[PDB]
Coordinates of C-alpha atoms and ligand atoms in Angstrom, one line a residue:
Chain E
X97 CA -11.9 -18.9 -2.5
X98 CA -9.2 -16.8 -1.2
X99 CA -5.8 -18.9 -0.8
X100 CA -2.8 -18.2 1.2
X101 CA -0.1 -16.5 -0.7
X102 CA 3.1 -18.4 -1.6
X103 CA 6.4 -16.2 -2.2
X104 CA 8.1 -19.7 -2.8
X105 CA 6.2 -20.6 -5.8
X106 CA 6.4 -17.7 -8.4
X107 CA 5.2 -17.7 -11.7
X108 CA 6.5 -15.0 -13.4
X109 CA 10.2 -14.1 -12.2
X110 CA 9.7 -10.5 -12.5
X111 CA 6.7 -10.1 -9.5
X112 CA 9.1 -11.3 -7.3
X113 CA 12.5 -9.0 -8.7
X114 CA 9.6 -5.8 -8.9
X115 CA 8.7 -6.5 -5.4
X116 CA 12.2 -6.7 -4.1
X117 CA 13.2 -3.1 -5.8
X118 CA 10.0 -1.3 -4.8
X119 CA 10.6 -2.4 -1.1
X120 CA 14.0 -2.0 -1.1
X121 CA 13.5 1.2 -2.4
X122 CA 11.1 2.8 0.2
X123 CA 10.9 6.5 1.4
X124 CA 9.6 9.1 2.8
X125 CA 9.5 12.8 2.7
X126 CA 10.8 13.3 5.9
X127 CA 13.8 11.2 4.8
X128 CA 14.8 14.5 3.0
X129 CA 16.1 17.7 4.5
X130 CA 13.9 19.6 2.7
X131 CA 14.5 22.6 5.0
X132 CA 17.8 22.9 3.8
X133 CA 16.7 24.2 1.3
X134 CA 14.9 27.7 2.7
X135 CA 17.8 29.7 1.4
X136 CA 17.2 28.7 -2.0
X137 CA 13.8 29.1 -2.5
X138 CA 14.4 32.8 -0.8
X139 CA 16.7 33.6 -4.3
X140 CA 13.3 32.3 -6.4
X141 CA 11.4 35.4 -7.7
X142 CA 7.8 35.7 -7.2
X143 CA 7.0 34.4 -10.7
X144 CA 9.4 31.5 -10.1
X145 CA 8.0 30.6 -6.6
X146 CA 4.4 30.4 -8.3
X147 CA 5.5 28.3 -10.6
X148 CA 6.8 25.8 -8.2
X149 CA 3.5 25.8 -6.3
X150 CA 1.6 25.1 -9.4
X151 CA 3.9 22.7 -10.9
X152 CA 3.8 20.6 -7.3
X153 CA -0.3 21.0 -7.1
X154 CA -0.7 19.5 -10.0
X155 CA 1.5 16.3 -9.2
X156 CA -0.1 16.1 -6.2
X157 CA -3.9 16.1 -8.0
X158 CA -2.2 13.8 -10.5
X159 CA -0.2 11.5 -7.8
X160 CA -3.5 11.4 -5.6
X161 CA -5.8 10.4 -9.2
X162 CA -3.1 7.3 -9.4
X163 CA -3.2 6.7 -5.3
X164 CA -6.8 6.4 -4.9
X165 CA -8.0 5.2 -8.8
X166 CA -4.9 4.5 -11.0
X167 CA -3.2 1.7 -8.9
X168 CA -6.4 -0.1 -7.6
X169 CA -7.9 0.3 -10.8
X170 CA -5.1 -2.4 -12.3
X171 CA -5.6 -5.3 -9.3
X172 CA -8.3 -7.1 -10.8
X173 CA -6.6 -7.4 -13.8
X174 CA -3.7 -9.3 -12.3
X175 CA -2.3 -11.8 -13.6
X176 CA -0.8 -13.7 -10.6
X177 CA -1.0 -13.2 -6.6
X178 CA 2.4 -11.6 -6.2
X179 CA 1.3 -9.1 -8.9
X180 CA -1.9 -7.8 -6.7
X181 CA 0.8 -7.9 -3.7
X182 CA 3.2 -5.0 -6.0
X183 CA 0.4 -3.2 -6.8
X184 CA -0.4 -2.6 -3.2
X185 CA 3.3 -1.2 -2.4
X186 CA 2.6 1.0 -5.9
X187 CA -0.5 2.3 -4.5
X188 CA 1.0 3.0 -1.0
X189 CA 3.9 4.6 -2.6
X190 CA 1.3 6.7 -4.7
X191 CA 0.2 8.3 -1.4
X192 CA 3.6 8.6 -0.6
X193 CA 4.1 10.7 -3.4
X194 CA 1.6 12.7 -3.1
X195 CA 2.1 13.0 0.6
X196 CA 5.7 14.4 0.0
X197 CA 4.4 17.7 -2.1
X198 CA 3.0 19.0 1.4
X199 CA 6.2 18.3 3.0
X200 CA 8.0 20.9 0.5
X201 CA 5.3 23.4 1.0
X202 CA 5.2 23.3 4.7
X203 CA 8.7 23.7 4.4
X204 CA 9.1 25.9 1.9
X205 CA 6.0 27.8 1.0
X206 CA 3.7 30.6 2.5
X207 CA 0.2 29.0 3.0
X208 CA -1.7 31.9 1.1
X209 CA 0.3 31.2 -1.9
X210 CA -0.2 27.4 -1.9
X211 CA -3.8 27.8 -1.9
X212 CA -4.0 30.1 -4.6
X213 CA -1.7 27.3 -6.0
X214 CA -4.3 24.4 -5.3
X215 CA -7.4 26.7 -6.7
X216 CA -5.1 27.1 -10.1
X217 CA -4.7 23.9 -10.3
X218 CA -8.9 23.3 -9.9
X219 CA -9.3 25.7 -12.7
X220 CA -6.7 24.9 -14.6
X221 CA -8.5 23.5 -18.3
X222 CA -5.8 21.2 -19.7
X223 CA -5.0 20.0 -15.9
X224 CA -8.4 19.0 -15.7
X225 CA -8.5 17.2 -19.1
X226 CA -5.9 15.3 -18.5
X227 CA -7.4 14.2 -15.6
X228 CA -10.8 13.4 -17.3
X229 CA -9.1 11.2 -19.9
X230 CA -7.2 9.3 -17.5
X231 CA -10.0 8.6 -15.3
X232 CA -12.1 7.7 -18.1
X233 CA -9.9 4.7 -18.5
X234 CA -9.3 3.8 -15.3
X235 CA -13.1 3.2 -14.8
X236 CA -13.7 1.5 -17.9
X237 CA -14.0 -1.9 -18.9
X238 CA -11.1 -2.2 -21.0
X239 CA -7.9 -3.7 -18.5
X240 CA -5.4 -3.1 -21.4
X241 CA -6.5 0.6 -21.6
X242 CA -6.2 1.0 -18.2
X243 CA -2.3 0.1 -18.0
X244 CA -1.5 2.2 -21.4
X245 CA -3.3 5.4 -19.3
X246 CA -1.1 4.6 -16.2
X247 CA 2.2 4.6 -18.4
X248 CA 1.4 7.5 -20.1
X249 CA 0.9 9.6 -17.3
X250 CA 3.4 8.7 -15.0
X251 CA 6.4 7.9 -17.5
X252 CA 5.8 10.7 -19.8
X253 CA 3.4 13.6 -18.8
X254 CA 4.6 13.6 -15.2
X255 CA 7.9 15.3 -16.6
X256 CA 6.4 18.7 -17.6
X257 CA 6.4 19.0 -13.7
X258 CA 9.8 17.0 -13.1
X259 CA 11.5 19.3 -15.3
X260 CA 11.5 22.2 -13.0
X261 CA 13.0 20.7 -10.0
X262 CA 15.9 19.2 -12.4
X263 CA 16.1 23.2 -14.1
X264 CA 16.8 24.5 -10.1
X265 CA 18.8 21.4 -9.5
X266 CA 20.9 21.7 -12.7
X267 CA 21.0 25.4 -11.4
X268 CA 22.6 24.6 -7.6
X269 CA 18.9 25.4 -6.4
X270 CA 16.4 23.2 -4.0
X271 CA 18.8 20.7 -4.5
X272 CA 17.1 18.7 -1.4
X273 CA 14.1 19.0 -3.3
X274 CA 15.6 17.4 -6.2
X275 CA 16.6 14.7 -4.6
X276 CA 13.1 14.2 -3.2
X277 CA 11.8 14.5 -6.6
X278 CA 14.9 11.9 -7.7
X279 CA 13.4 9.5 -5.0
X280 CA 9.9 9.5 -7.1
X281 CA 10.6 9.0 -10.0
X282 CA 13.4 6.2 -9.2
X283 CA 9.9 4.5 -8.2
X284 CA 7.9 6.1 -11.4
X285 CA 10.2 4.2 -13.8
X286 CA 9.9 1.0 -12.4
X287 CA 6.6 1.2 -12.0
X288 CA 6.7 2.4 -15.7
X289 CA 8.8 -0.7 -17.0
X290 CA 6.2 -3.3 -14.6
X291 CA 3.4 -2.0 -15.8
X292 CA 4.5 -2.0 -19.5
X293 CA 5.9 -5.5 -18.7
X294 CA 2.3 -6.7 -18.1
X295 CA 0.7 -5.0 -20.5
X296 CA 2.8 -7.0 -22.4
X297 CA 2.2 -10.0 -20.9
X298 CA -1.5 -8.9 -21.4
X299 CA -1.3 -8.8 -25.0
X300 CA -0.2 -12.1 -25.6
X301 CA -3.1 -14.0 -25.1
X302 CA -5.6 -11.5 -27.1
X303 CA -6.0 -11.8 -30.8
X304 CA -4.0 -9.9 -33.5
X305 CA -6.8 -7.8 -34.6
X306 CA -7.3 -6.4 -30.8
X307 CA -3.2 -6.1 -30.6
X308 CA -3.5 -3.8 -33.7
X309 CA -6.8 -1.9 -32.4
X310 CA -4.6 -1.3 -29.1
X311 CA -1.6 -0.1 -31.0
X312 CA -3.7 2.3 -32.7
X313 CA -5.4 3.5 -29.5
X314 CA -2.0 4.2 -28.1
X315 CA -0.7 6.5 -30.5
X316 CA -4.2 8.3 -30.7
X317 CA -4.3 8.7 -26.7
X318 CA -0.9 9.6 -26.6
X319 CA -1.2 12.5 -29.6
X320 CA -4.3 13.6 -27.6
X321 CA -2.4 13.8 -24.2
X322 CA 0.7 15.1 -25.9
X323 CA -1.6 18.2 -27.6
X324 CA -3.3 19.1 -24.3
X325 CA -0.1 18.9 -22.1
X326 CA 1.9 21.4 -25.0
X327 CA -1.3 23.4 -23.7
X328 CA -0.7 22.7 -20.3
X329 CA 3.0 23.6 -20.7
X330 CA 2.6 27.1 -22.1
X331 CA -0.3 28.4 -19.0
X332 CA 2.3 26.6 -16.5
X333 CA 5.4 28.0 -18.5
X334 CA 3.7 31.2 -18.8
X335 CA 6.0 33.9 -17.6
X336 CA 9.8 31.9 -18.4
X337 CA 11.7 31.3 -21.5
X338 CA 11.2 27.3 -20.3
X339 CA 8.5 26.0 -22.3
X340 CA 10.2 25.1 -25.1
X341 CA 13.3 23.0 -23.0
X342 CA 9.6 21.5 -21.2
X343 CA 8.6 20.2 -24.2
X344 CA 11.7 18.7 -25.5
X345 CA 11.5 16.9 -22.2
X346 CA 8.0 15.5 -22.7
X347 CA 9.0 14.2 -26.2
X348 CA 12.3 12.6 -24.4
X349 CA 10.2 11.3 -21.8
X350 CA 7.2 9.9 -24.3
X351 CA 9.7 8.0 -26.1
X352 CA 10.7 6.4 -22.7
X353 CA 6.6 5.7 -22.0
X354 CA 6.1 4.1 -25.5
X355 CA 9.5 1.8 -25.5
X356 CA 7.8 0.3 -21.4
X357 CA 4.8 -1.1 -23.6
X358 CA 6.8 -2.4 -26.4
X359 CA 6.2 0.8 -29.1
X360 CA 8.7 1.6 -30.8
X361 CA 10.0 5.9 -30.3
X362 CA 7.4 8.6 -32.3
X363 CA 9.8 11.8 -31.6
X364 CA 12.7 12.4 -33.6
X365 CA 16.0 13.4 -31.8
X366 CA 15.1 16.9 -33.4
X367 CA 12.2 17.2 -30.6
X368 CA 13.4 15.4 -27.7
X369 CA 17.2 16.7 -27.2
X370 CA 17.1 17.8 -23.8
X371 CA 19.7 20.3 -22.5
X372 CA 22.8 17.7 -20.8
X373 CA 22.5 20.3 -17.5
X374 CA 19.1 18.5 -17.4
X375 CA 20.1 14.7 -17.9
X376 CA 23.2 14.9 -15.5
X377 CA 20.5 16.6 -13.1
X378 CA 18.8 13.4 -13.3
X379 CA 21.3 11.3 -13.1
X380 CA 23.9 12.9 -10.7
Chain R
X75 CA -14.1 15.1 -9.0
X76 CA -10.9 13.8 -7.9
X77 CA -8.9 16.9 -5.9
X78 CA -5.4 17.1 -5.1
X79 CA -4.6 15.7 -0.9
X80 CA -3.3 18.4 1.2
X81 CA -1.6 16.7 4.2
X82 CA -1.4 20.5 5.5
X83 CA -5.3 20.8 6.0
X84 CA -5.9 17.8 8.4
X85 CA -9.6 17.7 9.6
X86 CA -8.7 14.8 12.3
X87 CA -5.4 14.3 14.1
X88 CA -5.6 10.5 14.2
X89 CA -5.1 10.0 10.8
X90 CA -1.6 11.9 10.9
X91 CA -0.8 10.4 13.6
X92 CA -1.7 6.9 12.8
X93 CA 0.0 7.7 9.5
X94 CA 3.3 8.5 11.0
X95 CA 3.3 5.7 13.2
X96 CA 2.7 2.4 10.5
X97 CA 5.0 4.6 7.6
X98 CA 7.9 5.2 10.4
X99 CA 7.2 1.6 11.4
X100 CA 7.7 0.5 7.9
X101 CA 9.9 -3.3 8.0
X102 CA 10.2 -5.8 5.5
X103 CA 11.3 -9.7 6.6
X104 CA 14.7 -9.5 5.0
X105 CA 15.3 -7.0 7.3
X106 CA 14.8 -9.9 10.2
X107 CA 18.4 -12.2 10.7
X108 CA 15.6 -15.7 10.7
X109 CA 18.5 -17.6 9.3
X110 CA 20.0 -17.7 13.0
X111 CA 16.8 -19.7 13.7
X112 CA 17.8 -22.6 12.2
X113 CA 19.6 -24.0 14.9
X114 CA 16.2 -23.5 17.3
X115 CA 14.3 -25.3 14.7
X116 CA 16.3 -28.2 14.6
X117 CA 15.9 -28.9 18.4
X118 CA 12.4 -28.6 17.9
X119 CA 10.3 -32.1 17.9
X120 CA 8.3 -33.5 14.6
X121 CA 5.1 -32.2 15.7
X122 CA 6.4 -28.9 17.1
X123 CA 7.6 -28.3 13.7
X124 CA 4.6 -29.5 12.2
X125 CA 2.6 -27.1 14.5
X126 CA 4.4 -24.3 13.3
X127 CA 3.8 -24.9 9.7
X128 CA 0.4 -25.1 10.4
X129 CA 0.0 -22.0 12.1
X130 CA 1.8 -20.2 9.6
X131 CA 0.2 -21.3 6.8
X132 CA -3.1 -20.3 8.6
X133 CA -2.0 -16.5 9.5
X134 CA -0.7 -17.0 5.5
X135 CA -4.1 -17.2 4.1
X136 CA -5.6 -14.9 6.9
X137 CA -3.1 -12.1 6.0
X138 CA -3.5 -12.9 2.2
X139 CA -7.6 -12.1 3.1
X140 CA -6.5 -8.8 4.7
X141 CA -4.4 -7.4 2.0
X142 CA -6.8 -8.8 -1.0
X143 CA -10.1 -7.6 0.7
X144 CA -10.2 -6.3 3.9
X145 CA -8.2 -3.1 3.8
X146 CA -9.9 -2.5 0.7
X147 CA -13.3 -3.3 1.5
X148 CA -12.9 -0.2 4.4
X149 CA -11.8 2.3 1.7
X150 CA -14.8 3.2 0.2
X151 CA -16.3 3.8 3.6
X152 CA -13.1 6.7 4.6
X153 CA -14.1 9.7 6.7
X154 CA -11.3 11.6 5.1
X155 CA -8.7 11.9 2.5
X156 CA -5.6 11.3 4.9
X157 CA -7.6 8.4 5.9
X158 CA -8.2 6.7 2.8
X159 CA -4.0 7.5 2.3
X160 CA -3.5 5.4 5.6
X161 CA -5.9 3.0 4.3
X162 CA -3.6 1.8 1.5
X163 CA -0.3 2.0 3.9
X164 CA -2.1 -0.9 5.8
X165 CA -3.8 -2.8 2.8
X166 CA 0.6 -3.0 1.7
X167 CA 1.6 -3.9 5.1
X168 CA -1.1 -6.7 5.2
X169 CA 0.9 -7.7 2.1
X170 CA 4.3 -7.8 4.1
X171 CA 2.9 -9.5 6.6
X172 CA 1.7 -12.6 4.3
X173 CA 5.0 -12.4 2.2
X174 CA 7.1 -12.8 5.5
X175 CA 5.5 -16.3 6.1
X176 CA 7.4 -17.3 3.5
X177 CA 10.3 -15.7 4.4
X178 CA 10.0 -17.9 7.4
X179 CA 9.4 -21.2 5.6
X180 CA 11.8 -20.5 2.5
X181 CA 14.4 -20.0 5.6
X182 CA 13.3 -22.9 8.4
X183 CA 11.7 -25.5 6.9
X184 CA 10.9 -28.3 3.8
X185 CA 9.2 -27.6 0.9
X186 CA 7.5 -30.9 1.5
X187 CA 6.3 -29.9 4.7
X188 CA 5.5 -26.7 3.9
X189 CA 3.3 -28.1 1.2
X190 CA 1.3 -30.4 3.1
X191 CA 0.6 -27.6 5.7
X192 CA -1.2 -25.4 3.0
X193 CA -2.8 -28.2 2.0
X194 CA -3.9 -28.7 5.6
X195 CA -5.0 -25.3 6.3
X196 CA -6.7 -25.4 2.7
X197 CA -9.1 -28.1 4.5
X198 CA -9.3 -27.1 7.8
X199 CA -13.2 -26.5 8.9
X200 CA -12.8 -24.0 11.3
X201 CA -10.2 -22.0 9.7
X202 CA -12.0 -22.0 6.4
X203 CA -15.3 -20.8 8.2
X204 CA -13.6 -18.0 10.4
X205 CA -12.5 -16.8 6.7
X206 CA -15.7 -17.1 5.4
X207 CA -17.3 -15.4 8.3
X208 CA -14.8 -12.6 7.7
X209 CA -15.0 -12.0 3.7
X210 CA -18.9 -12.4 4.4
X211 CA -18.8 -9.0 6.1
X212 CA -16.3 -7.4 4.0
X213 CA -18.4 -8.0 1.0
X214 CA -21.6 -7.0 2.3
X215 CA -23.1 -3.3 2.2
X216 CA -22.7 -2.6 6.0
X217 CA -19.4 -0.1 6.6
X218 CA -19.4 -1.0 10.6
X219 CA -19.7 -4.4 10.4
X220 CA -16.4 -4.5 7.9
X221 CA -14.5 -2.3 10.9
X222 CA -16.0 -4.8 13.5
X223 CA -14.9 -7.9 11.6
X224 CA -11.2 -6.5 11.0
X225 CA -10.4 -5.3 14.7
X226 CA -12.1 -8.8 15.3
X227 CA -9.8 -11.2 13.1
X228 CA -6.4 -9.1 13.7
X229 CA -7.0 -7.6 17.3
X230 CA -8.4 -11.3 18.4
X231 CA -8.4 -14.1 16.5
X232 CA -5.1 -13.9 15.0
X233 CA -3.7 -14.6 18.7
X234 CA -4.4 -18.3 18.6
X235 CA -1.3 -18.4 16.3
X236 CA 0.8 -15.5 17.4
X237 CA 0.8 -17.8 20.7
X238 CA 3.3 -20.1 19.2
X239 CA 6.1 -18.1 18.7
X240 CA 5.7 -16.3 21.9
X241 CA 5.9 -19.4 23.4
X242 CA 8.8 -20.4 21.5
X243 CA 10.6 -16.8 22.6
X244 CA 9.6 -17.3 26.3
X245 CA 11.6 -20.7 25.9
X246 CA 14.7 -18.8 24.2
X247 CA 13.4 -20.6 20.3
X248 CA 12.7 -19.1 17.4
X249 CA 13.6 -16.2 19.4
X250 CA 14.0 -14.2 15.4
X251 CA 11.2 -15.6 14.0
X252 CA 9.5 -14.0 17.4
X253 CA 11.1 -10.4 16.6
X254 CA 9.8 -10.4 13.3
X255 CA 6.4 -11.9 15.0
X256 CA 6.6 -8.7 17.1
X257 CA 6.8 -6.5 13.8
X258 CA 3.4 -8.0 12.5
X259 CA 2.1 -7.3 15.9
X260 CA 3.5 -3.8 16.1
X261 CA 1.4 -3.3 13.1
X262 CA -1.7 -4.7 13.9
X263 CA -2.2 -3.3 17.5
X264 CA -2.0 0.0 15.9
X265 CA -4.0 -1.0 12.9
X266 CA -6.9 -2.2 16.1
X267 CA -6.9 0.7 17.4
X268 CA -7.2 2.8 14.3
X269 CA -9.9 0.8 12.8
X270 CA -11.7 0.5 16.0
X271 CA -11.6 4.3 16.1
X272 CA -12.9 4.8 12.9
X273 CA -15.2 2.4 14.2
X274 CA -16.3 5.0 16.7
X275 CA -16.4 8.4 14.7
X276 CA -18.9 6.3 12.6
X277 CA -21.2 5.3 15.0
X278 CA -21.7 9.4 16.5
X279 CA -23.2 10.0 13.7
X280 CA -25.9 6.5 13.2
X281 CA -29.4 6.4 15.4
X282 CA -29.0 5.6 18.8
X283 CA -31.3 2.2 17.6
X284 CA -28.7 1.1 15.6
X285 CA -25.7 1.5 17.4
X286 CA -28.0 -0.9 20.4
X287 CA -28.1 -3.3 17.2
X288 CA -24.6 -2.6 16.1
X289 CA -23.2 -3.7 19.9
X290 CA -25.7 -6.8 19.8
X291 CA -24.4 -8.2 16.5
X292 CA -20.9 -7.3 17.9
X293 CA -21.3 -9.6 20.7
X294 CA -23.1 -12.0 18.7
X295 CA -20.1 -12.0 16.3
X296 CA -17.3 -12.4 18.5
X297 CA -19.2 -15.4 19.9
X298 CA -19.6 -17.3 16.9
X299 CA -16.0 -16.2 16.1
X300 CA -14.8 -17.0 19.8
X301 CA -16.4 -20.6 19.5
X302 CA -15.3 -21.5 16.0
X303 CA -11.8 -20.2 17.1
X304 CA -11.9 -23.1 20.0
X305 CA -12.3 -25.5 17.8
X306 CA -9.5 -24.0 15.4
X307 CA -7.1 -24.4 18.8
X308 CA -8.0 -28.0 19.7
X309 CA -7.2 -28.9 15.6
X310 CA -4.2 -27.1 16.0
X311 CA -2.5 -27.5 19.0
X312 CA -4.0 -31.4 19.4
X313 CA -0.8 -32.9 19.8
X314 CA 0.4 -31.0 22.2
X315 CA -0.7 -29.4 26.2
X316 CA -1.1 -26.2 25.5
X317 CA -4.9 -25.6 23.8
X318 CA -5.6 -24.2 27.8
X319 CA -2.9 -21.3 27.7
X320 CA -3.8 -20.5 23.7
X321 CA -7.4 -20.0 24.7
X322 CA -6.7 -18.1 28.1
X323 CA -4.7 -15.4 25.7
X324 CA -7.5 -15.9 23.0
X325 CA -10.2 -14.2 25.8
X326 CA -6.8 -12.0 27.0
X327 CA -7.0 -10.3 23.3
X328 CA -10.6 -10.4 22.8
X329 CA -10.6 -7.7 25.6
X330 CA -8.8 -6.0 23.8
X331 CA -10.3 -5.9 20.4
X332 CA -13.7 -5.0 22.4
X333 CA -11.9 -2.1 24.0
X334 CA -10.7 -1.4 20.3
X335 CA -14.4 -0.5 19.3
X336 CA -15.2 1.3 22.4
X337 CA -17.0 -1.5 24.1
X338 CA -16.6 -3.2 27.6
X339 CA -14.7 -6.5 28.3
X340 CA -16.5 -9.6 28.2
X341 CA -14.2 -12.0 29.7
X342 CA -12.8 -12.2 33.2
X343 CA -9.7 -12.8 34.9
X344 CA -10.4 -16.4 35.1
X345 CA -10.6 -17.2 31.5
X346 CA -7.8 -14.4 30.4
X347 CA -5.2 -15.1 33.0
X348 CA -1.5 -15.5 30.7
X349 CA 1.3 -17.4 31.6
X350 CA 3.7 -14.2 32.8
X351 CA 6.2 -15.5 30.6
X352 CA 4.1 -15.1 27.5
X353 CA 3.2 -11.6 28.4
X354 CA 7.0 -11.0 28.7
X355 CA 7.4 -12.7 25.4
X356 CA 4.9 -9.6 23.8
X357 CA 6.9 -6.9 25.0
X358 CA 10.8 -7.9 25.8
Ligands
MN244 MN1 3.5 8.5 -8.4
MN245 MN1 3.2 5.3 -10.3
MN246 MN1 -1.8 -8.3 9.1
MN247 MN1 -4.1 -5.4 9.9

């Protein structure tokens, strides 16, 4: 029995405030002037420019897995009406997202050297993986899994591809780009922080034993991401001095991904000190 | 094997340009003044009002349907990537559409009354059926009967109740509520079409056998729908003279979802013939 939905009587506060700033907030590529910035990516070197390409392929693989699996993959697992309602705008936006990497390389970018991009990205072992175990989750049977996979990839391993836009950005370079790429994540943390928010939720009404088994899960998924994308960082990284600034980012970010499901920090300020070019690039 | 979308390799032109129209389309009910309505609904009579609540709470659990299962139900079936990304731009507008009933009612009216009409359209027969009839096909294992049922329930059937505030518009009430009316509307002609042409780009490639049994059940459908949705008017609209005029734009729409799937009109002038002043109402 399917009943009519009632934004007048909400159960849990948040649905409706998580709503209201994922509408609010809605974009689209084309919003950007992405052509603006042509110059720019004219002073990349070759090495740079591929780097871009494969960095932004595999978001988009990434952005599409969360589009098509990721966000669908948590509606049955709702726990009231206006929840399933936000995770149709978060699934929509996914496409979004993934929709707006074209629109910076058929701005930007030669088409030969995008598809060599894409067919890296197919290749590409610890790309894959991370993939794999994500997927894995989303199609099994365990909803609080599911939500701990989602967190971790968009609030913490998304950002050894966000770094580079905030590196140009930080550098006076595809700034319009980095303002695209601002747009996307100012939806990736919320989704982040509602996700984590009912994961929480979630966890109250399973028993302690699970809530241990879960917190132990975590840290093992997130050590097993964390190895394969320090992998992924240095065959991305390859041909820069970045990867180690990358990495310190991913720990930064990881932190952030934990603390949105209620875990307290693993990396020590020793590992996670990003470079303040990088944070005011953020947050300009 | 989830692969990465490239909005640069589009294998059928419809789906960009379908998914430029609903994402530049892209409203949200706050975005409507429907406070400057509350004057018009105060001059409107008991039963007008309780019409209205009625109808809304009707399109409520109808739209509700839409975003919960229908949009979703037709994902699976996608011809192609780009498609299954419009797919979830329309499964979140379904979702705006529902929330902006409430909108209306948190705006216009009691939260007694507003009560007692969900609890009215909760145990209406023939609006229960029609949404029976609907989820029926959505959950079954026939892709072309899911398209035929949507084009049917938002291309048709949903024009019993987007009569009222047409009405109300063409006598200078409601005349926001109307605009915002004309937003859902905006959406749903295109989403008709779209559907109705994936509709058709399914059917080239079936036997010529069962596309004759594809029209048949068709026809057969939007009977049964057409003759439960007569009896959902004379429930409605019982207290007032205008069940002939609903149903004349009823057959008026019907047309049109038939011409949405590629298939002739059934009803004549006669029985499709709209008040001029209606019509206006629709496109201002
Ligand atoms: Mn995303
Ligand atoms: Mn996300
Ligand atoms: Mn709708
Ligand atoms: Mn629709």
């Amino acid at each position: 029995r399917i009943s009519a939905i009632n934004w007048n009587k909400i159960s849990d506060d948040k649905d409706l405030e998580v709503w209201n700033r994922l509408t609010s907030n809605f974009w689209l590529p084309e919003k950007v002037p992405l052509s603006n910035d042509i110059p720019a990516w004219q002073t990349l070197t070759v090495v740079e420019q591929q780097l871009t390409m494969r960095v932004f392929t595999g978001l988009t693989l990434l952005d599409t897995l969360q589009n098509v699996i990721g966000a669908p993959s948590l509606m049955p697992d709702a726990l009231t009406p206006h929840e399933e309602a936000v995770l149709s705008n978060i699934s929509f936006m996914e496409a979004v997202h993934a929709r707006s990497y074209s629109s910076i390389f058929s701005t930007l970018c030669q088409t030969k050297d995008v598809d060599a991009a894409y067919a890296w990205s197919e290749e590409n072992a610890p790309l894959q993986r991370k993939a794999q175990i994500i997927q894995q989750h989303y199609r099994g049977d365990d909803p609080l899994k599911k939500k701990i996979a989602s967190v971790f990839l968009e609030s913490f391993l998304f950002y050894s591809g966000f770094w580079l836009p905030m590196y140009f950005s930080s550098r006076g370079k595809l700034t319009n780009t980095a303002d695209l790429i601002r747009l996307i994540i100012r939806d990736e943390a919320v989704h982040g922080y509602y996700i984590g928010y009912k994961y929480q939720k979630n966890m109250e009404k399973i028993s302690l034993g699970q809530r241990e088994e879960l917190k132990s899960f975590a840290f093992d998924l997130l050590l097993e991401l964390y190895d394969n994308e320090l992998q992924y960082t240095d065959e991305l990284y390859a041909e820069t001095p970045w990867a180690d600034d990358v990495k310190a980012f991913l720990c930064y970010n990881a932190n952030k991904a934990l603390m949105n499901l209620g875990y307290e920090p693993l990396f020590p300020a020793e590992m996670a000190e990003v470079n303040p070019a990088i944070l005011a690039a953020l947050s300009p």
